[PDB]
Amino acid sequence: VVDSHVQYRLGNVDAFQLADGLQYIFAHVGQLTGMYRYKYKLMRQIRMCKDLKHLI
Amino acid sequence: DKSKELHAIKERYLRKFVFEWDASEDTSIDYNPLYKERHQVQLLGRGFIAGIDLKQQKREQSRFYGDLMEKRRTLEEKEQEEARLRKLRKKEAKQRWDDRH
Amino acid sequence: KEDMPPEHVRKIIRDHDKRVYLGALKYMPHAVLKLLENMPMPWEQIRDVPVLYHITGAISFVNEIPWVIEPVYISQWGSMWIMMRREKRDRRHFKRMRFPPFDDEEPPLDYADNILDVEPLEAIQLELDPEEDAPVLDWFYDHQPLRDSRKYVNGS
Amino acid sequence: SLFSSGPYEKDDEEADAIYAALDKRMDERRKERREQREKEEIEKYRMERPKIQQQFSDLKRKLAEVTEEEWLSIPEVGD
RNA sequence: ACUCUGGUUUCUCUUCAGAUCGCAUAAAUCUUUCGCACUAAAGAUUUCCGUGGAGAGGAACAACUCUGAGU
């Protein structure tokens, strides 16, 4: 997230592109983060984020 | 449906990290038509749901309130409404005028 | 306990008995939570924030809290949604980042060098027509909209 | 602990004292009520949770009264 | 229309708060529950996420616009 913000502030991508990147780094991020194996309980939060992404 | 309704009446009388919630766990499969196809919340022809596209939401209106508005409004009221609609269309065109490639 | 300029903290970070550093390292998750909470909103381009730079420099925590007026935040979110819908329906050739940053093993970019120099691009600020947005023209966009208006807000 | 207890010093003592004071200050929010409730719960559990040692504690206290002749005349269980 | 204790902002500490302490929402342990528990419910406990109440102390600039009061 911090590096995406830096790239948004380094002129690599547009601000709308930064918002899309944040949306990707939050929703559908269980695959990217891979925190489910570390703590199985987080899968509920991952499913909630997926549902929020679907609604949005 | 009908057989499903009768079966429901009789019934009332008597590891793996799944990422996406499967559609099996969904609800709102109602046999009755009245509780399946219910009239939407048409806010007196002047409102709609949030988030959805305003142009799309207004386009897909039921037109029931619009008919009453066009068959009840006064002639001067009709002229004022036409002027307001013309102003809104001009604003949309100005928005459409700023779009180019 | 007077404050100090951030330049000293940046120099210490770029420059820095392992007792003091190891002892105070026990609060990194709090710093991570503070950094997540104090991330800039889409309406803001650069969001300066106050932090707590440890003497050892092991962890710096953002002392500020993200308190925002509810109607102002709702208006910002609605304007952001409208602008996003417009940009999506217009810029159909949208190339989302949709990838991890290039630093697979690269050293972290120095915020002084590659982040404190380039002027950022314009954020997602919906156009404000003074015909209907006059009462909230200046109050619509800010890190803290009413951080100084005594008449409107409580204060700092 | 991943950090060996060996490499300490007076500065280490000061840093540890400061960190422990900060932790104790940040842990005193509900510390009094939590401690009182936990003590009451332990007292309640003492009614239904006798230690194996506690079990034979009353017998072991009186068992010391056996004299040396009594503690030496104990026959082998084979007879 | 006379006068009068009465300024707000902000920092810190203590203490209390079952009030939707917060128009938000997590974690952990035990317990009961059918398993053979991310994909599950119940009861409790605890720590965070951060508040309101009051008191105490501190530094900035308002001194009576204001209001309550002494006409």
**E strand or H helix at B11, and its extent?**
helix B2-13
Nucleotide nearest B25 (Cα, C1'):
E39
Determine the residue type at D66: V
Q: Which residues pair with C52 in a beta bridge?
A: C61
User: Are A4 and A22 a contacting pair, CB within 8 Å?
Assistant: yes
Q: Which of D19, D22, D25 has the most C C-beta neighbours within 10 Å, making it the best mutation to test the interface with C?
A: D19
At residue B45's C-alpha, the angle toward residues C134 and B59, to 5°, is 85
Tell me the CA end-to-end span of chain B in Å, nearest whole number.
53
Nearest alpha carbon to residue B18 among A46, A49, A51:
A46
Q: What is the CA D51 to C1' E71 distance in angstroms?
A: 81
Residue B24 to residue C150: CA distance in whole angstroms: 55
Residue C156 to residue C144: CA distance in whole angstroms: 9
What sign does the dihedral B79-B81-B83-B89 (CA atoms) show? Answer: negative
SS (H, E, C) chain C: CCCCCHHHHHHHHHHCCCHHHHHHHHHHHHHHHHHHHCCCCCCCCCCCCCCEECCCCCCEECCCCCCCCHHHHHHHHHHHHHHHHHHHHHCCCCCCCCCCCCCCCCCCCCHHHHHCCCCCCCCCCCCCCCCCCHHHCCCCCCCCCCCCCCCCCCCC
Token pair recorded at residue B52: 């959805």
Q: Which of C81, C85, C90 sits opposite B99 (nearest CB)?
A: C90
Nucleotide nearest A45 (Cα, C1'):
E38
Interface partners of B (3+ CB pairs, < 8 Å)?
A: A, C
On whether any CB of chain B is under 8 Å from the CB of A32, the answer is: no
**E strand or H helix at A47, and its extent?**
helix A42-55
With beta carbons under 8 A apart, name residues in chain B contacting A36: 17
Interacting residues of C122 by C-beta distance below 8 A, sequence separation 6+: A15, C45
Backbone angles phi, psi at C52, to 5 degrees: -115, 95
Determine the residue type at D32: E
What is the interface size between B and C, counted as CB pairs within 8 Å?
3
How far CA B27 is from CA of A43, A46, B22, B23, in Å, comes to 22, 21, 12, 9
Q: What is the CA C28 to C1' E43 distance in angstroms?
A: 34
- Please tell me what resolution, in angstroms, this structure has: 4.1
On whether any CB of chain A is under 8 Å from the CB of C120, the answer is: yes
Query: Is chain B adjacent to chain D, meaning 3+ CB pairs within 8 angstroms?
Result: no
Q: Do D18 and C19 touch (CB under 8 A)?
A: no
DSSP B21: P
What is the interface size between A and C, counted as CB pairs within 8 Å?
63
Chain E nucleotides reached by a protein CB under 7 Å? 8-11, 14-16, 26-28, 36-39, 45-51
Tell me the CA end-to-end span of chain D in Å, nearest whole number.
55
Q: Do B21 and A31 touch (CB under 8 A)?
A: no
Alpha carbons within 13 A on the beta-carbon side of D2: 2
Q: Do D9 and C19 touch (CB under 8 A)?
A: yes
On whether any CB of chain B is under 8 Å from the CB of A49, the answer is: no
From the CA of B32, how many Å to the nearest CA of chain C? 37
SS (H, E, C) B30-97: CCCCCCCCCCCCCCCCCCCCCCCCHHHHHHCCCCHHHHHHHHHCCHHHHHHHHHHHHHHHHHHHHHHH
From the CA of C151, how many Å to the nearest CA of chain A? 33
User: Are A38 and A30 a contacting pair, CB within 8 Å?
Assistant: no
Experimental method, per PDB record: cryo-EM
From the CA of A14, how many Å to the nearest CA of chain B? 19
Q: Which residues pair with C53 in a beta bridge?
A: C60
Token pair recorded at residue D29: 């929010």
Residue B37 to residue B35: CA distance in whole angstroms: 6
Determine the residue type at A2: V
Q: Which of A18, A31, A45, A56 has the most C C-beta neighbours within 10 Å, making it the best mutation to test the interface with C?
A: A18
With beta carbons under 8 A apart, name residues in chain B contacting C90: 99
